[PDB]
Each structure stands twice: as structure tokens, then as C-alpha cells.
Design a protein around this ligand. Sequence first.
Ligand SMILES: Nc1nc2c(ncn2[C@@H]2O[C@H](COP(=O)(O)OP(=O)(O)O)[C@@H](O)[C@H]2O)c(=O)[nH]1
Ligand code: ALF
Ligand SMILES: [Mg+2]
Lengths: 314, 134
Amino acid sequence: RRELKLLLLGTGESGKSTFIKQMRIIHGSGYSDEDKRGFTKLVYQNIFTAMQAMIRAMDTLKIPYKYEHNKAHAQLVREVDVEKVSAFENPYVDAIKSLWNDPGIQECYDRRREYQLSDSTKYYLNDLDRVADPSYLPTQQDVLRVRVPTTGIIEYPFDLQSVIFRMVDVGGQRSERRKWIHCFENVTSIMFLVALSEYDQVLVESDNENRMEESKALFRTIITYPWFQNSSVILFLNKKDLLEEKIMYSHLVDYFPEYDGPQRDAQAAREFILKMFVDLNPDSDKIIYSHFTCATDTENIRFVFAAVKDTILQ
Amino acid sequence: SMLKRLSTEEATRWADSFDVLLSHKYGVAAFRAFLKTEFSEENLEFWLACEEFKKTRSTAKLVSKAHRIFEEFVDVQAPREVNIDFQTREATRKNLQEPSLTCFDQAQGKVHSLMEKDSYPRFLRSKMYLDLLS
Ligand SMILES: Nc1nc2c(ncn2[C@@H]2O[C@H](COP(=O)(O)OP(=O)(O)O)[C@@H](O)[C@H]2O)c(=O)[nH]1
Ligand code: ALF
Ligand SMILES: [Mg+2]
């Protein structure tokens, strides 16, 4: 009956809902074989939606297909209403496998920062045979990977033996933020998520605004709120795994020209990002606790929860 | 004979699909109650306002009604702003300058989608819904 309220805040796509799923795996009722079947259709839909994005991007960016047969496949795939998708069959399976293989589409994917494409694309697209199998059953990892946008404010209680954690998940897009006031009361602690990999991206909500500039502005605002002066603040710099990949091809200095460290170096990059965040409130002497996280990594998230509970909240 | 309980059946029907739920008057109402506890009822209000806007007969009424709906749900800083992307917002603004019955199809779709994949499944696992089954 001893109870603590913890907010998960952050801009859209930071990984807030993924944290909730991990709580469910580590401290809640987990995911049964039956639960996993409920995610099948979403997996399919994420795949179609991702390929449709790339297909429209091929035009917008003026990238030609390398193989002619792939145009017909793109016509086929573009005509699909993703809402009505419930199975993943040929000719759609082979069209998508075949599209994903075109060096054109691969350029388009490498240039994904210039449009909007969901983070788990590569993970699904490299594994279409597994997913296509007539009797495919999503793994726990497929479930952690799936994209479903959150709207509103939602409370998930979880019983850790000694204490109840009341975790609050929220929508992160601008329009959603006006509602946050509804969870700001009696907050023990805040877990603010930032996507390490969002440095070269722009917001979905708006026209050509940098996603990381947005997280900074938001973090700064939260930290200054006086009703949070006694709430502990934990900054999770999430998606550190995607950072490892992306840093090899997309240079941080091209987005944050103050970065004077080496190129193609994930560690220096993430230290610079961390530093930027910590430097937003020079007049506050309030503590920021941070950790680099990978929200889709259960072991990584298990640790991060034990440490908040064992160290920070006692 | 085989017994089936009318309220058990009704509530079960709501779980067949979200479109089924939306055609059950008591489904809509249960779902709305739920949205309100998640502060996301503007999604359903917007959606309903579009279904109704599709019914309009007078062109005169159509024009100003499109403006009301946009000012109310779509524009940035709208009092009941729905979570949609920049493109859908802007496509809607373009549509607005020569308004028709399809003016909000794109936006109504995104919102439909939002509800369907996020709130609806959670509602089906809610205690409020589950209590109506046993
Ligand atoms: N690889 C990787 N994917 C992540 C990580 N965190 C979140 N994701 C994925 O990114 C997408 C968006 O995460 P989500 O939790 O839905 O965002 P939010 O709830 O809007 O903050 C989902 O597809 C997640 O699977 C991460 O640390 N690593
Ligand atoms: F973009 Al979100 F939960 F913040 F889906
Ligand atoms: Mg979410």
C-alpha cells in the first residue's frame, strides 16, 4: 500500500511507451503467447506503413529505383489501405522483400532523416521471412519494437514487492503536452526520455524543426517548474543502440556546430549531448541523474529500474 | 436451449473491432467515458464531428461548418487539438479554402487510427469494460 508516482515525459517517439512494456515484462504480468498474437497485425501494419513512406519518399527526393521490376511492386504496395491489413501474404511479401533490396530504396533509407520513418523499420525489414511465415508468432522483441503512438495520459500501477510504483505514460507531440498538467501533482520522480538518435531529425508535428532542439527546450521548461523542485529528475538518454549505427553516417557537428569532438564516435557524441542538457539550467543547483539506455533491451531497463528504486528513492 | 446474456453479448460485440464498437451506441458511450479518464476524448469528438459534417446538405452550411471544425480541432493551438502530423494538418488547411465533403477525410483517418491502435485495445483490458463481461 506504500505508493509512489513517477512520470515518463519526453517528446514524441522518445521511448516512453517502451519503458511501460518493459515494466510489464519485469514487474507486471508479462506477455503470454496469446498476448503476442494480438501484436501480429500491428507488426504487419508497421511494415506496410514503413514501405509506403519510403515509396513516397522515392518521389519526393527524386531517387530512381535500380531495378525496373520494383516500380510495379511500389505501385502494388502504395495502393494498400493499411487500416484494412490483417494478413501478410504474397504478392505483398515478395514485393516488399524485393523493394527493400533495391539500392535505390537503400539510399532512400540512408536519407530517412529528410522525411518521417519509424525507427524499427530496419529490424522488421531484415527479418521478413520470419514475419511472412504462415505461422509467425511475435517474439517479445518484436513486441518491444512495434510502433503505436500514444495519445492522452495513462497510469500503470506495478507492484514491486516493497513499494507500489504508479507510472504515468503521456503523449509527447506538442498538442498532447497541454494535457500533462493532469499528472503533475504529487510526483515523486520524473523520468525524462530523450532519443539520442534524434539529432538529425525534424518533428512530425511541424515544418522543419530539429527534434533535439525541441527536447532541450522541453527539458529546460520541466526543470524550472517550481512544483518539481523536490521531485528527483532522471534523464534517460535513450536509443543509444541506434546512435551506434547512425553516428557512422550522420555527423553531429552538422546539426550542433558546437560539437568539437571526433566524428564517428558514439561515446563522445553522447557525452556532448548529455553535457548540453545538463547545461540548460546553470542557475539551478538541482541534481540531474542520468543513464544511457536502450529501451528495447530488457536487461538494460531492468538495471535502470533497480537503481532508481534502490538508490534514488531511498 | 442455449442461454446468452444480453449485456454480456452486447459488450462482447464491442471487442470484434473498433468499427463495430463505433456502431454500438452503448459502445461509444463506454468508450467515451474511458477517453475522458485518459484525457483523450477530443479524438472521439473530432471523429463524430466529421461523421456529422459528411451529412451536410446546404453548401452555405458546409463552408462555415468546416471553419468551425478546423478552428476547434485541427489548427495549432486549437482548444481541442488532435494529435496529427504537419502534412495532414496542412493538407486540411488547403482543403479548407475550397471546402467539400472530403475536407477532413485524411485527418479523420489519422485520428480514427490513433484511437483504434492505442486507446481501444486498452479499453478492452480496462476493469470498467471487463466488469461488464462477468
Ligand atoms: N532500437 C531502439 N528502439 C527503441 C528504443 N526506444 C524506443 N524504441 C522504439 O521506438 C519507437 C517509439 O517508442 P515509443 O515508446 O512508442 O515512443 P513514445 O511512447 O512516443 O515515447 C518504438 O517502435 C520502440 O520500439 C531504443 O532505445 N532502441
Ligand atoms: F510519440 Al508518443 F507516446 F510520445 F507515441
Ligand atoms: Mg507512447
